[PDB]
Amino acid sequence: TTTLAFRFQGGIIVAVDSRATAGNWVASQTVKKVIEINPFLLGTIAGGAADCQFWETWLGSQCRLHELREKERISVAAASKILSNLVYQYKGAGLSMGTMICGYTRKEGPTIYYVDSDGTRLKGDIFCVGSGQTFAYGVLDSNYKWDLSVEDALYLGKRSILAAAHRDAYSGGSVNLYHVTEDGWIYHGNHDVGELFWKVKEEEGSFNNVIG
Amino acid sequence: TTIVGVKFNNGVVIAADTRSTQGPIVADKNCAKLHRISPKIWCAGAGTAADTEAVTQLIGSNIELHSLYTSREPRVVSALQMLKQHLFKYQGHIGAYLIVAGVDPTGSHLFSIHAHGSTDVGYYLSLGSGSLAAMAVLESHWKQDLTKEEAIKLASDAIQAGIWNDLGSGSNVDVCVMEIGKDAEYLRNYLTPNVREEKQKSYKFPRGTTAVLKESIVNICD
Amino acid sequence: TQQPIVTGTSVISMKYDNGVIIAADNLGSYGSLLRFNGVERLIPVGDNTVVGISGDISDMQHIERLLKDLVTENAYDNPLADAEEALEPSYIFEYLATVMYQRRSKMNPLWNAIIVAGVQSNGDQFLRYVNLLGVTYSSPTLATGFGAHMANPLLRKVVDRESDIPKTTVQVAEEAIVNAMRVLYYRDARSSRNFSLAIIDKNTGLTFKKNLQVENMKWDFAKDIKGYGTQKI
Amino acid sequence: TSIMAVTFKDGVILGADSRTTTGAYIANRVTDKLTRVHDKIWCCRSGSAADTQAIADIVQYHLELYTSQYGTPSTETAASVFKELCYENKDNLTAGIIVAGYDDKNKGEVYTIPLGGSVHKLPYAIAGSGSTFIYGYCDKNFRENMSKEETVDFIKHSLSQAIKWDGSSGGVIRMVVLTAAGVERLIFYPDEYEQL
Amino acid sequence: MDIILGIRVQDSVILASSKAVTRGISVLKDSDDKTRQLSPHTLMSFAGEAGDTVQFAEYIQANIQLYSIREDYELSPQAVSSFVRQELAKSIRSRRPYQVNVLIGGYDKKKNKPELYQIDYLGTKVELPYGAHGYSGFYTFSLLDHHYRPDMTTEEGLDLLKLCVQELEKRMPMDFKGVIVKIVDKDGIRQVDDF
Amino acid sequence: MDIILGIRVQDSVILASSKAVTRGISVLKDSDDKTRQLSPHTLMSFAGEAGDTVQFAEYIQANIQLYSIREDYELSPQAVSSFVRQELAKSIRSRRPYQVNVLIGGYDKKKNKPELYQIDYLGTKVELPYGAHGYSGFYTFSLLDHHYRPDMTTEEGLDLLKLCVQELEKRMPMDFKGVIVKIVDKDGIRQVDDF
Amino acid sequence: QFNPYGDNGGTILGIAGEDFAVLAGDTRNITDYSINSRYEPKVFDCGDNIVMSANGFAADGDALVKRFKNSVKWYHFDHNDKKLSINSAARNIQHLLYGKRFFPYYVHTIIAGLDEDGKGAVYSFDPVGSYEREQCRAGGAAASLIMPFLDNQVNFKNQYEPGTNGKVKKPLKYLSVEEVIKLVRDSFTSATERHIQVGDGLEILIVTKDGVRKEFYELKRD
Amino acid sequence: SDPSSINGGIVVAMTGKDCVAIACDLRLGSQSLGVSNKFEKIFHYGHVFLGITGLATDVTTLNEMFRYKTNLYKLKEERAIEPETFTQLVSSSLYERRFGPYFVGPVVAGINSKSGKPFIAGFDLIGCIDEAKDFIVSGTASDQLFGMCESLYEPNLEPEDLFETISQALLNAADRDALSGWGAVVYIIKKDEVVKRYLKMRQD
Amino acid sequence: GYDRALSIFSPDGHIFQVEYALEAVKRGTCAVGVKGKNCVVLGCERRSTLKLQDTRITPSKVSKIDSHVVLSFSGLNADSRILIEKARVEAQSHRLTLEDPVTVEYLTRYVAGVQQRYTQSGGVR
Ligand SMILES: *[C@@](C)(CO)[C@](*)(O)[C@H](CC(C)C)NC(=O)[C@H](Cc1ccccc1)NC(=O)[C@H](CC(C)C)NC(=O)[C@H](CCc1ccccc1)NC(=O)CN1CCOCC1
Ligand SMILES: *[C@@](C)(CO)[C@](*)(O)[C@H](CC(C)C)NC(=O)[C@H](Cc1ccccc1)NC(=O)[C@H](CC(C)C)NC(=O)[C@H](CCc1ccccc1)NC(=O)CN1CCOCC1
Ligand SMILES: *[C@@](C)(CO)[C@](*)(O)[C@H](CC(C)C)NC(=O)[C@H](Cc1ccccc1)NC(=O)[C@H](CC(C)C)NC(=O)[C@H](CCc1ccccc1)NC(=O)CN1CCOCC1
Ligand SMILES: [Cl-]
Ligand SMILES: [Mg+2]
Ligand SMILES: [Mg+2]
């Protein structure tokens, strides 16, 4: 996997690949690695497929029960901590989960929380998670500014996944984009790397290592 | 693999399947496991494919040089002795399991050799992953004083038992008959009971389906 | 986690036109030591089922007791215990298959391979296999251990598929089983000459044959075999 | 394996089963474990088939070369050559060999050579996996200066029990008689010896 | 030994190599030059097992310098890289192999072209527009995929290189104490003193 | 989690804790606050196994805050440190122990004295004038043995602390991305924003 | 030491059409190099127009199918005979599989049927419960052989429109039940040729709004 | 630490009507890291073509070794080596290193200049010859290639049609393997002309 | 364990034990709550039959549950301690998991839930 999400002037960008592997066997190219918890909360998944999917699907149920009981949408902090406290109970049992809880609330504003299976929980502006996280970091960090436009931010997130999809053997398939604003998350389409790479190469003039 | 050997009235017959595996994958569906050591001494091989081929060629080469040196037709016991001493020296690391048979001035012979260098004598023998399926048939149907046509039938039946019941064996049946006073006849693909059925569809693509980036003429000449 | 101690070898079986045949030798091996020679490894349940068991004998004796207890339990408050509500081969099998899998799932398996041979109430032949892993499968011929490697090939020459079952008589089928038992005596180092054979027919019922012996063996050719290559004497 | 050699009035008799195994599978049910290293010096082979054959082949070569130079070797000499191979290559060999031969001066002699490579001269010797089950029987029934018929019966009854209890032993009972008269091969089939 | 980078541009090859030498929980030196000049227009940076690296580099350097004297002629970067690969290809099946990864940057005077070769300890050679060994590649390759252009100048290459070092200094766990940068072109080899 | 230091001076306790959070070959965060306020005049820094550290710190924080509400009274640093030690002393013989090392800096309002306690994951407590956990101690202890005086001011303590961080930045293999410094005195806890 | 798992081999295949869906699987059951059965079905009708197969370790496969069949039964009892939708069944199966996260069912599971819009549906599961709806999926021993062929022939991957300079892709379209069965049969005959654990017979279950139909075809028995 | 799957890569060869085709991917990586997208795995010595998958250092070493041996062959024999003869040479050379082998999966392809017969062959790492009428496969996606070739292939294909079949076999197999892809090359070989085509494939 | 159902319904549809618990509250000292525009004030009565008291150490009538919530009561004094303790623990538990202090409604809902549980649990009054 490769997944990222960064915070900026116009909210939060979230971008992920869609590959799933069993060793060197490419099992799937169409996996959905953004879990839609509610209209204001997103969750990225990386690591063990079943672990991530099962427990973030479970997280959505816990968040639903919160707003039924409290008559109010759960905070991004509280949501992330439910998940982190869950995986901490299973610490040592061998769960493999690298997740990022992204969302907006009134009291917090746009917020991103990194959570992993060995119990680490971190608030932050930029995070890249997965086997190809380093490849995404390289492109993202070197082009990141707080004052990016919504248009430029969406592209940088897309381009960072594309970079990782190219170099990392265990990442690829397609890019799924999301934009989180004060009004909630907005889906910005599925982008197959098969067409996106050549489109980016020609227009941008990058990827000169590859035989054109 | 499945390989067998059966003695009869005036000679000996050996047989083998034609499957070659690479893990659970069938690499070759029609490989030849019957090897010629000398004109009238042939060898069926099971185990490590490269080793059975290599060890049989080496001994076959030295048998030829020996035959020229001594001005005599080579003997099966010479091939047997040279093989077992070679295999023993390498302590089983050369994974060749062989059924050695043939005719020579002494008569007709049938032996087996294992990777560690032990040899056995018999009227009927079987080696390889499907040796138990083959040996079951041999034990059920073998008798003393077999004819040529009976021995070929018994041998090919023993290989068939391996083909059907052992996953390590399959495809076709190779046979070699070595009769006294006659030329040895190598019957490549003696039986072919595993023919691929007609495919339901042709997958011939329309020309231009594959996307191309560059073309160029390659220079093979000087 | 176990290791098997006193063990029983191959159990072989096949279907024929009117019923099923099953056989197993009377040996209880203790490693390479052929320790016990009076061991019955075919156990009838009612007059329509025979359970053939290989592997650990202590676990076999446990299974005997379970089957014995199953007959008792079925008879309770059951006026039709010897008629419509009698134990079927399929009932007996599924019970064992449930136990075998439950035990493997608790990492404490019954170290056996079992073949339940019988005839159902509607006349259909029943023949199904189950082992220490809870793995189950059915086939016109079934065999355990060395039987799977040597018997099945021979028995499949008689009944290679479903359509060959009506064409196979009890005479032909028994002959193939007795032949298979001889081959196993030749080639299985933990086998014995003495064995038991059971026929469950839809017409003639259960015929249980004890104290059989492997006979008509070929050993004469051994005298002609000298040395291991050269040797002439 | 089950193997034995027994001295008696007229000479010595070697005896063996005919089973070769790969795990629990019987690779050969008609094996000949009694093998000739010289005219009237033979050996019983137990342990690795590959090792014992390799060894026996070398000993036969040595004794043939001995005979060309110094004439017929003694049974003791043959056992010494077996020992030298088994002892010096003890780390790489699995061979339990019994050496038996007939001299005219020394009559019948039996030397046994276990795994270690040590030599032991005995009136009779037993070896192989199935020998464990007949120590009691053979000790109680063996007598010195037996007749040919008595010694054949002693070996037949002994190997019959060894075969009966040892799964690694079976098939036919081969025997080889070594006397002044010459070399005689004997064979005994299951139908005879099993019901003893 | 950790970070070694290489970038081939229009008219030169630029090699950046980390200055830190660490053993245990101590940085023993922060001014280490992880490179040797094989010939006037060929430079080899190196990284790997302690001791092996310098021993191998100097052994190669000695052999190339011997060739230069014997023939009164400078070997091409392609020829040097092939010699180096063969040495490592022998090494890997030795009793104790050289655990050394290298980059060979050179300027071919006959072709008038810069050339960058990346060779690992197994003897795996590849000619590249940009290269890296160790964990460095996991950041720099994707970064260069984006920003690199084949027709760049040396000054543009140095800015592109600064961008790599900045990213490594931000995301790498270990402190590698900056880099020594060297440029290989038609005029030979020279070191950038202020980086 | 790596570097946590502590220096008790005349009238205060100063805790310095590294900002880096690393997993694998990536620094995930460079602004991490490795401390929790247990009470208005007691601060606990922590370092160790991922997940365990924060889980343990917050669990202690919750318990001390519960005590404060129940009794309407602040526990002494000595009492807090003894409670923490016992928790770790239980932990070590559990099915899965907390692998967390802590420093507890506090100002005792009854004694009018600063106090620094160093407790490891085994539950080994010691009161010290200066303390450190992990590899940090191998540099800082000898440095403080030399430069530390018991009658120093808070400003002198911060200069003494700068001297430690400089040495660590020079000789430590890993980049720990600087430290967050906090001061505990009679007026409570406050953070030095510019360090 | 006791190993609670085993490999019973075999391979399975699911393909979805516009108003139908197929779930195929060979009938061979094996352990190591022995054949256990030439006809042991592992594709099952579970009710509510849902077909299911759990290929891998047969004991776990049978246990899972048995439990899901039972889950369907109790779904009817607890919710007024309501039809279990394919999407609901999939989620239910995830909880069955993940329920044994720390002692898994060693199986690749595939279910097939029709979604609530009446369109063909195929879902696939890993051993611990991660699932995904797809037009296409092969599972089991020969999945690596069959799957890329399906990508090419079902989803038209790497196929471009002739003469468009590799710029226009081959347009996606649903396949007829006749065309799908051709691809299934060719996939299995190809897999039988090159994989030793695949053969004997092929059993296809086709699911339409009318019900569940079956089709059987012979495969090579070597 | 499995030599055969560190660098990754694939080679496939097919026969047609009076022609052969051999094709390979372009990836060279170090496990997950993709390093080079120009690493060709097919070489040629005269009219005989050799493809090599496996450990890249050995791919390079063996190419240089067979160039060495075929050059001496040509000087002494005064003719180009034929595919049948070259196949034997490869087998000899590999088995020479029986107990310390090159970690490779070579594939010979070419047309015999005397008889005009199309010829292909494969080997294991210790030199066992795998001759075939239809096709030979090799590399980290060999399973995938076996599946594609066995279904897509048919005998007596024309060069233009054969190109489409082998190209689709390679591409769809490479897309199901993480360590293969990153570009591809296809050689179409006729009796006295050879066309080399670079394929457009997904770059992930 | 003591299982007896002490709180049960009577023919007229009343739970007498709950109603007799109200009588205990009616016996207790008066407590008053008044909320203004920007504040809340909790007034409490203390009976003056007890002289020679030590007002420093005597348990105060108003208790802090957290730094922002307070709880006063009327009725059995010993019973009130159990509710206050449970509420104080839940207040810290909420801060730990939700990373935010309890609302006054939530804390009330919790305390009320505890009181309810004791009206249909066996063995308790
Ligand atoms: C990038 C793409 C790769 O790391 C991402 O990190 C993705 C995350 C996405 C899918 C959410 N990770 C994976 O794809 C993940 C890698 C992985 C594998 C194993 C453990 C941890 C991480 N892959 C999986 O989870 C696959 C997904 C399937 C193929 C759709 N599942 C498996 O590999 C399963 C379950 C593994 C498992 C985990 C925990 C306990 C038991 C099992 N295993 C198999 O399918 C085994 N199999 C048998 C023979 O066929 C080959 C595969
Ligand atoms: C029956 C069919 C047994 O299944 C027969 O015994 C035949 C004998 C015939 C071919 C003469 N045996 C095989 O087919 C034999 C089975 C086997 C496999 C592995 C070890 C021993 C026996 N198969 C082979 O020898 C193949 C021949 C190929 C298909 C041309 N070779 C391999 O499978 C090699 C094994 C090489 C080897 C080296 C050192 C010691 C033992 C064996 N394996 C590979 O090439 C696998 N791998 C591919 C990726 O690259 C690295 C190696
Ligand atoms: C009785 C049977 C036992 O003492 C006799 O002593 C005979 C002696 C006669 C034959 C001269 N011994 C054997 O039959 C002997 C038993 C044995 C087995 C293993 C080590 C030492 C002794 N059997 C063999 O030597 C067979 C003969 C073959 C089938 C022709 N060889 C094997 O079983 C080989 C031997 C490999 C070996 C291992 C250690 C030292 C020397 C050689 N083993 C295998 O092939 C392994 N086999 C693979 C299949 O799974 C089961 C094990
Ligand atoms: Cl022997
Ligand atoms: Mg990739
Ligand atoms: Mg077969």
Short mmCIF file of N, CA and C in Angstrom, two decimals, chain A residues 86-96 116-119, chain F residues 49-52 95-97 99, chain G residues 101-102:
data_model
loop_
_atom_site.label_atom_id
_atom_site.label_comp_id
_atom_site.label_asym_id
_atom_site.label_seq_id
_atom_site.Cartn_x
_atom_site.Cartn_y
_atom_site.Cartn_z
N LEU A 86 -8.64 0.20 20.92
CA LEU A 86 -9.03 -1.14 20.49
C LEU A 86 -7.79 -1.95 20.13
N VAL A 87 -6.99 -1.43 19.20
CA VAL A 87 -5.80 -2.15 18.73
C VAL A 87 -4.77 -2.35 19.84
N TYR A 88 -4.75 -1.44 20.81
CA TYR A 88 -3.85 -1.57 21.97
C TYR A 88 -4.19 -2.79 22.82
N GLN A 89 -5.48 -3.11 22.92
CA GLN A 89 -5.90 -4.33 23.62
C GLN A 89 -5.36 -5.58 22.93
N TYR A 90 -5.29 -5.55 21.60
CA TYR A 90 -4.77 -6.66 20.81
C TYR A 90 -3.24 -6.59 20.59
N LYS A 91 -2.56 -5.70 21.31
CA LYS A 91 -1.12 -5.51 21.11
C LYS A 91 -0.35 -6.79 21.42
N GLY A 92 0.45 -7.24 20.46
CA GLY A 92 1.18 -8.50 20.56
C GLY A 92 0.52 -9.66 19.84
N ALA A 93 -0.79 -9.57 19.61
CA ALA A 93 -1.56 -10.63 18.96
C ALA A 93 -1.31 -10.72 17.45
N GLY A 94 -0.73 -9.67 16.87
CA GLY A 94 -0.28 -9.71 15.48
C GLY A 94 -1.15 -8.97 14.47
N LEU A 95 -1.97 -8.03 14.95
CA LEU A 95 -2.74 -7.17 14.04
C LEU A 95 -1.78 -6.28 13.25
N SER A 96 -2.10 -6.06 11.98
CA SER A 96 -1.30 -5.20 11.11
C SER A 96 -2.18 -4.11 10.49
N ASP A 116 -1.78 3.39 14.44
CA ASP A 116 -1.25 2.10 13.96
C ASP A 116 -1.46 0.97 14.97
N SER A 117 -1.14 -0.25 14.53
CA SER A 117 -1.49 -1.46 15.28
C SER A 117 -0.64 -1.72 16.52
N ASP A 118 0.50 -1.04 16.65
CA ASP A 118 1.27 -1.14 17.90
C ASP A 118 0.96 0.00 18.88
N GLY A 119 -0.15 0.69 18.65
CA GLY A 119 -0.73 1.61 19.63
C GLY A 119 -0.40 3.08 19.48
N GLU F 49 8.56 1.70 24.63
CA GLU F 49 7.85 0.99 23.56
C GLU F 49 6.68 1.82 23.03
N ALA F 50 6.48 1.78 21.71
CA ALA F 50 5.39 2.51 21.06
C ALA F 50 4.03 2.06 21.60
N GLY F 51 3.13 3.01 21.81
CA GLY F 51 1.80 2.72 22.34
C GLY F 51 1.79 2.65 23.86
N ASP F 52 2.62 1.78 24.42
CA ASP F 52 2.77 1.63 25.88
C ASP F 52 3.00 2.97 26.59
N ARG F 95 1.35 -10.40 32.43
CA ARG F 95 1.38 -11.16 31.18
C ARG F 95 2.10 -10.35 30.09
N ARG F 96 1.73 -9.08 29.97
CA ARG F 96 2.42 -8.15 29.07
C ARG F 96 2.76 -6.84 29.80
N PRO F 97 4.02 -6.70 30.24
CA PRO F 97 4.44 -5.50 30.98
C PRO F 97 4.47 -4.21 30.16
N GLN F 99 6.46 -1.43 28.85
CA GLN F 99 7.86 -1.12 28.57
C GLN F 99 8.02 0.39 28.46
N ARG G 101 -9.96 -15.14 13.42
CA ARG G 101 -8.77 -14.39 13.01
C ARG G 101 -7.47 -15.00 13.54
N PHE G 102 -7.51 -15.54 14.76
CA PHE G 102 -6.31 -16.07 15.41
C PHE G 102 -6.19 -17.60 15.34
#
